[PDB]
Write a protein that binds this ligand. Structure first.
Ligand SMILES: O=C1NC(=O)[C@H](Cc2ccc3cc(OCc4ccccc4F)ccc3c2)S1
Lengths: 245, 262
């Protein structure tokens, strides 16, 4: 049984590294300790950051949207490496990605976060939590919930090898609305779940029930996504540019 | 065979099942016996329309409000039963009293909807200790803003019920729900996490022993916690609406305190 499961873990890790330029390993090393990021903590510091790397709040949001569009393509490439995924119904592949990317983006953003701020543009920059919190409403409440989640998620001390499998688990979620053929999606998720469980037992033998703790984080994660979507609708209150986004 | 660690986990499972049976008068076992017709003596009266609802009160508001307040009062009762169960969970009553309150505050509705699934099939739900069965379509026919409030619970139940869990499983799962270290405003997280660790280990073993052919049932069960949270959040949203449109509908203060700043 375990031959396939070790193959799956390694394959997903290799694909994860190929698809995502800034890994957690590289992010934690930047956030702790040889070249340091430019820190954006202030309106004046943001201004210099742009010369180095409408109004301030809007342009940060637009910056976030640009990155998110990039991440959607990274995630999609990654998904296509997950054994079985490309053999699913094409509408189902689109549905899984459509409803999965937000969950994945905030999961992976935790890798770039500590309790005080978030790495930006390939780790070249670091924007503080308090500066993001200071932005005028409704932009000030945009990132805070993601920081609160990240603190709780990061306490699990997952590495890139664990996260590669967890992200795959998220993508293969059989409860997405409008799926045509749930069976093979659940069947693949079952195999990914088995692989994640073994990976956490081998990689973190002294962390009791880490597998269970990790799956429980989906509860807060989906809640975060639902609140975020609602805030995106509130924010909706060059034509080609709006099309891209 | 077994070892001392898994032996302790078995005793914990047995203790929790025992307390569950003592705390909850209507078990899944009894609910399924009523629903599936293991019955000449246990058959429910079925409410599927106004007249059958009238006739059923032989075995003082308008109908939608009366039904909605029925759910409220039943919820109030459930909170009592769940609080009694919680006290049996080893370590729970030794926690900081404020954390006891917080865990119940955030846990009780998730437990209520979990256990409500036991009383449900795709066509309706048992009421009045199993003596009645109200149809899903009758519930969906109630006037705005009440016609939609049970649908999310039925959709969840049908998916939840496909896991085919029994009371012995549920007993440990609901303990896991209560002992969550990620509830907002908890003072001392570590003691709570340590208890949950133990409960998770016990649930995992229980599911392995009770459902040996059911692959990754533990994981799939844990994944359903996200569904529960979504039911709670959506219901709160619906209550806000109901309250504004029906300025004459009351909300029991126990429930109102549970929902306050949730
Ligand atoms: O605003 C609220 N806050 C809460 O805590 C409550 C949550 C809630 C909702 C529905 C329920 C249905 C139940 O059985 C079925 C049932 C019972 C009587 C009448 C009709 C029924 F269909 C049992 C408990 C229930 C609890 S209502």
């Amino acid at each position: 049984e375990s031959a396939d499961l070790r193959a799956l873990a390694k394959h997903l890790y290799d694909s994860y590294i190929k698809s995502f330029p800034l890994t957690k390993a590289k992010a934690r090393a930047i956030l702790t300790g040889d070249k340091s990021p430019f820190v954006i903590y202030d309106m004046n510091s943001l201004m210099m950051g742009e010369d180095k790397i409408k109004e301030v709040a809007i342009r940060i949001f637009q910056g976030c949207q640009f990155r998110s569009v990039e991440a959607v393509q990274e995630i999609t490439e990654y998904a296509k490496s997950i054994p079985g995924f490309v053999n699913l119904d094409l509408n189902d592949q689109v549905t899984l990605l459509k409803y999965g990317v937000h969950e994945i983006i905030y999961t992976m953003l935790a890798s770039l976060m500590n309790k005080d701020g978030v790495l930006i543009s390939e780790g070249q920059g670091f924007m503080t939590r308090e500066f993001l919190k200071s932005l005028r409403k409704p932009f000030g409440d945009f990132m805070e919930p993601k920081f609160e989640f990240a603190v709780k998620f990061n306490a699990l001390e997952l590495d890139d090898s664990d996260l590669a499998i967890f992200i795959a688990v998220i993508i293969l979620s059989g409860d997405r609305p409008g799926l045509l053929n749930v069976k093979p999606i659940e069947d693949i998720q079952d195999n990914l779940l088995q692989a994640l469980e073994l990976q956490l037992k081998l990689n973190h033998p002294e962390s009791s029930q880490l597998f269970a703790k990790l799956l429980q984080k989906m509860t807060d994660l989906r809640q975060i996504v639902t609140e975020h979507v609602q805030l995106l609708q509130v924010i909706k209150k060059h034509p080609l540019l709006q099309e891209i986004y």
